[PDB]
Subunit: 228 residues, 3 copies
């Protein structure tokens, strides 16, 4: 519970906060309208995660959920972070390839379902039911990945070269990191409990920084964000 | 409480889920940008309701509220469904007639107030106060219906013929179904308690499927969704 | 707690409600597309505050929070009001100067952080931690004010004259009123408790009406809202 994993929470808080400041400073030197959208979106991601990481570190974003026959510590603040940051990350990818509003809404909607059902599963009191919510959330995640490959990948190409390769790298990064979340949830304290909360927190922290800050570094360092 | 009405909840879950899949498959054959917006919006509606129906069926979206001198079972998950699905349905209507952003914001805002105040009323502990919230929510609903007739109906016409007639039918469907919700709430467990929760659940399920799936069928089967 | 301050809550409810109706009637005489956006945004602000003021008056938007060694009455409904009304007010300012989407997202995001962290601080059980959240929220507020002066003020000018002067006055009003909120929070029941809840409620009510209704009056009475 709220002790062993404090170091990963403090490290996560520090890393999000440092990334936010870096992106903020880096973005000061920005005039291009479109480059500005990418900077605004990308800087807000770590800023939000920073606040939620801090809430968990201080104990606010933690709650106890009874199931399986025990009082299980559940960090609900994560979902609070994910509800806003994941759609923003998807927005960066969509703006990059200039997706139509229809596909953007589909991605945002699928993302809301993924995080929402993930939260319902995290707070469910009937053990077996938790995995039903996990499956539904996972289906929503696969839909998103499908759109990113069969509804996006085919358009980045019909666009500028630099936009295509940058999108391809960010797309690959997203697919790899995002797919790991359901696995961590399944084996950790929220699911089967095969991995202790301490290790679970460490895993999400590494994933969260790589998806928030790592992702932002790649994106904000490319010329794909400027109007040619 | 959480037993007799299980069948309507299970039927509702199944019907939303089937509608979502149908719209998903049907939309695979879609290239037109605008047709895509209508499919994305319309498919997300049943998808959300599906998750909330399931949460109620499993018991997660149910809570007890003390008032009138009793512990009353209240399915709060409904509001959670309504908060997102009603504005999306209004968006379908607005896109159809190509409404201006000003009117869209007014509708979305009025809708948020309608659902929000409806939720406050559902969870209020002072019996008489529940109806004050019901009245305010009902006023917000009338505003929406007013805009749909005196701020929309007059524009669908100044547009394409097929757009006008389709909008007219969907407009009529909406007015009829939506107006029934406050009545059901008033006579059911949330309000006067003249109708038992069992029958109340049945009523909302029939209304919810007709407004979510029935509405989508009419819309997604018309040529009004394509750019001529 | 829920008694002495009832008059300020009732006065606040009445003033928001009257402002909403006034703006609604005033806006009936509106055809211009852009003028419509300003009316829709501006009328929704008092409408939302009206509902939240009423929830506090009736006792629904009030909760008890343990900290410092006492059971402290906290009106959480305020944040619920602020989460939606502050970004809408910022939207009025942004539309006025025709800000780019990038800056709009930055303002909305910073605003969400400001209100969200303010709420976490309001509900925090560890006294000293409450001020950590206050500081973070205050930093987010300063960012917003910075953008309004160094990212907005310089563009209203490169626009129409009437737009510039109206923006300047609304900008000034915002800076003055918004800066007062963190001070009231710090000295009131949410913070140091130097000022009683009764006086705290009075202060927020005066600020809330001036920022919601006062602000709307200035804006909706200017020619800057019309397309020349
Ligand atoms: C903050 C950044 C990212 C990329 C967060 C991503 C989170 C997910 C993709 C979470 C997915 C879940 C699934 C598919 C099912 C179990 C519950 C989760 C919400 C962890
Ligand atoms: C899911 C689809 C629809 C069309 C849901 C509609 C819901 C309403 C129009 C609810 C309205 C309410 C009112 C006017 C007052 C009592 C409380 C309600 C939230 C049920
Ligand atoms: C309803 C209208 C307005 C203008 C409300 C404004 C509210 C704020 C600017 C609140 C700011 C806060 C800060 C900076 C730190 C303490 C907590 C608050 C949420 C009160």
């Amino acid at each position: 519970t709220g002790r062993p994993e404090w170091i990963w929470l403090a490290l996560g808080t520090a890393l999000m906060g440092l990334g936010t400041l870096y992106f903020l400073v880096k973005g000061m030197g920005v005039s291009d309208p479109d480059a500005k959208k990418f900077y605004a979106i990308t800087t807000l991601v770590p800023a939000i995660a920073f606040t939620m990481y801090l809430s968990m570190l201080l104990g606010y974003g933690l709650t106890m959920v009874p199931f399986g026959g025990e009082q299980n510590p559940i960090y609900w603040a994560r979902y609070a972070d994910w509800l806003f940051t994941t759609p923003l990350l998807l927005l960066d990818l969509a703006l990059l390839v200039d997706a139509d509003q229809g596909t953007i809404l589909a991605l945002v909607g699928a993302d809301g379902i993924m995080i929402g059902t993930g939260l319902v599963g995290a707070l469910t009191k009937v053990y077996s039911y938790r995995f039903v919510w996990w499956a539904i959330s996972t289906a929503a995640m696969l839909y998103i990945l499908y759109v990113l490959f069969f509804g996006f990948t085919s358009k980045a190409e019909s666009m500028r070269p630099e936009v295509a390769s940058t999108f391809k790298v960010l797309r690959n990064v997203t697919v790899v990191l995002w797919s790991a979340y359901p696995v961590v949830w399944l084996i950790g304290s929220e699911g089967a409990g095969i991995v202790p909360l301490n290790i679970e927190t460490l895993l999400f922290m590494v994933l969260d920084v790589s998806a928030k800050v790592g992702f932002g570094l790649i994106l904000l360092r490319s010329r794909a964000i400027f109007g040619e």
